[PDB]
Amino acid sequence: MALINPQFPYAGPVPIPGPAPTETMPLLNYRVEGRIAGIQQARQFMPFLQGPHREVAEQTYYAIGTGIQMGQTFNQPLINTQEG
């Protein structure tokens, strides 16, 4: 967006020496076929386990029984003959 100087104008570009025209043109680089080499193993001996863990520990229980329940020799009360 330059302003044209009317007192000192200039013309378009003139030819100048050039950079040997084939040396600015590249070759198209020619890929050969390739292979991810080797026979891959199916599994890996991992350093960490792959499953979930638990944040807190919960107390577990198992039921037990008591035993054969016996009789008893109670201390027996007195007879309510109007004193009680």
């Binding site: 590249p26 198209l28 680089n29 350093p47 960490f48």
Partner: protein, 47 residues
């Protein structure tokens, strides 16, 4: 107008393989673990 170099024309024909290469690198670096380990030790006389 716009003219692409042969390097930029190759980058547009390989742009879906490069997107699959970037998202496979992000999965590897997220889910793997860096290990350094000694593989060989030797002591010699160089004569």
């Amino acid at each position: 107008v716009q003219q692409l170099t042969p390097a930029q024309q190759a980058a547009l024909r390989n742009q879906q393989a490069m997107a699959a290469n970037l998202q496979a690198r992000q999965i590897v670096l997220q889910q793997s673990y860096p290990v350094i380990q000694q593989v060989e030790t030797q002591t010699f006389d160089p004569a």
